[PDB]
Amino acid sequence: MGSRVVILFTDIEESTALNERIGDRAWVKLISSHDKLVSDLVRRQSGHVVKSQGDGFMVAFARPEQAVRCGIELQRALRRNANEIRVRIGIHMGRSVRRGDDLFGRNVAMAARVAAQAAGGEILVSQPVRDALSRSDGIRFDDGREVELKGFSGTYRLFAVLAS
Amino acid sequence: AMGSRVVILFTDIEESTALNERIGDRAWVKLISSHDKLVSDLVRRQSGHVVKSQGDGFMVAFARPEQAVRCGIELQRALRRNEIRVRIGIHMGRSVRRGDDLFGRNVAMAARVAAQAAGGEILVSQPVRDALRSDGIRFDDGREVELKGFSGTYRLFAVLAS
Numbered sequence: 602m603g604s605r606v607v608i609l610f611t612d613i614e615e616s617t618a619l620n621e622r623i624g625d626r627a628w629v630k631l632i633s634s635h636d637k638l639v640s641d642l643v644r645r646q647s648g649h650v651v652k653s654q655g656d657g658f659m660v661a662f663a664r665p666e667q668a669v670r671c672g673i674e675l676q677r678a679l680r681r682n683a684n685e686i687r688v689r690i691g692i693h694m695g696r697s698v699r700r701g702d703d704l705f706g707r708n709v710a711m712a713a714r715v716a717a718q719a720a721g722g723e724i725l726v727s728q729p730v731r732d733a734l735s736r737s738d739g740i741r742f743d744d745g746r747e748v749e750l751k752g753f754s755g756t757y758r759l760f761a762v763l764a765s
Numbered sequence: 766a767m768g769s770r771v772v773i774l775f776t777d778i779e780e781s782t783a784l785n786e787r788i789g790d791r792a793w794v795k796l797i798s799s800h801d802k803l804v805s806d807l808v809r810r811q812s813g814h815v816v817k818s819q820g821d822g823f824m825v826a827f828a829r830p831e832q833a834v835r836c837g838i839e840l841q842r843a844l845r846r847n848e849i850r851v852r853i854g855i856h857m858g859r860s861v862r863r864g865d866d867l868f869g870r871n872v873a874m875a876a877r878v879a880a881q882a883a884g885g886e887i888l889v890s891q892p893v894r895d896a897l898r899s900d901g902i903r904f905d906d907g908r909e910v911e912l913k914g915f916s917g918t919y920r921l922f923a924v925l926a927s
């Protein structure tokens with residue numbers, strides 16, 4: 602059931618506290634700039650922004666390498682800007698159901714929970730994504746760590762992207 | 766906080782992920798599609814506007830707090846008639862309304878109020894409570910909670926419906 606897709610979620614770390622610190626005027630400007638940054642970088646990796654959730658985005662890619670490259674570029678850009686906003690990123694792949702400009706299904710929820718596990722500045726991918734990129738020449742992962750994900754049974758191993 | 770005054774209602778399904786996993790994607794998509802139509806219908810009856818979806822819930826704008834609360838009351842009633850339990854939180858304040866979206870700290874606050882609600886419950890912030898027996902709505906005495914990202918405590922009031 603559903604078409605196979607790679608889902609990337611972004612979320613800003615402690616965005617509510619940031620918004621409260623800087624005030625709504627500054628926040629709207631910051632989030633507009635951030636939206637444009639994410640949108641541009643997604644487009645470069647032939648991805649599609651499915652939707653935004655205030656301080657985060659759900660993004661779809663056809664290939665896992667595109668999702669990871671996008672995450673890598675986004676973290677790089679955020680580091681460059683910081684000269685502050687930290688973003689966590691999670692990537693998962695599997696079948697999901699399209700409805701309008703949205704995605705539904707357990708693999709959407711799982712991608713979101715993978716992102717929720719990541720620290721600010723970090724890109725985490727699920728084991729299927731790591732395995733699919735086991736033979737990549739430029740993408741490197743740590744040895745992963747075991748977590749449990751809300752709503753799911755059992756344990757999942759999540760892998761951090763190690764960028765050049 | 767900047768922008769125009771708006772009433773923001775959030776819904777959220779309790780343990781939707783576990784529910785998805787138990788019944789499967791086929792059944793879940795059918796269920797959430799049905800749920801979406803129900804929420805959209807009830808929102809429109811109280812002159813609200815769905816701003817967006819957040820997977821298993823919605824962000825809704827109303828001009829007046831009585832509209833948002835009546836919507837929540839009808840939604841909870843409807844869900845009982847129909848298992849999915851929904852949390853509902855309502856806040857009001859100034860927000861920036863740009864490109865068919867709402868931005869600002871009062872958006873985040875409304876989300877946090879909804880996250881504090883029990884499944885089956887409608888929680889409102891103090892400003893909503895204060896703005897409303899003249900219009901047929903009753904509340905408990907409130908509970909004081911901390912909300913992630915905000916300093917100090919906030920008194921949240923449950924709607925007591927017939």
Ligand SMILES: Nc1ncnc2c1ncn2[C@@H]1O[C@H](COP(=O)(O)OP(=O)(O)OP(=O)(O)O)[C@@H](O)[C@H]1O
Pocket residue numbers: 612613614615616617618653654655656817819824866867868869872873874876877913914
């Ligand atoms: N434009 C928007 N659309 C939808 N939701 C929004 C919007 N703006 C704010 N929100 C809400 O505000 C909240 C953003 O805060 P979030 O829950 O990510 O915690 P945070 O303060 O970033 O802390 P952390 O993510 O580090 O736990 C979300 O729950 C989201 O629903």
Ligand SMILES: Nc1ncnc2c1ncn2[C@@H]1O[C@H](COP(=O)(O)OP(=O)(O)OP(=O)(O)O)[C@@H](O)[C@H]1O
Pocket residue numbers: 659703704705706709710713751752777778779780781782783819820821
């Ligand atoms: N179609 C979708 N679009 C966007 N996000 C989705 C979608 N489906 C699932 N999600 C994500 O999965 C999340 C479910 O998270 P939530 O934190 O609400 O968990 P839950 O399983 O409902 O448990 P509880 O709400 O009781 O904590 C959604 O809020 C959203 O972040």
Ligand SMILES: [Ca+2]
Pocket residue numbers: 612613614615616656
């Ligand atoms: Ca966040």
Ligand SMILES: [Ca+2]
Pocket residue numbers: 777778779780781821
């Ligand atoms: Ca939920």
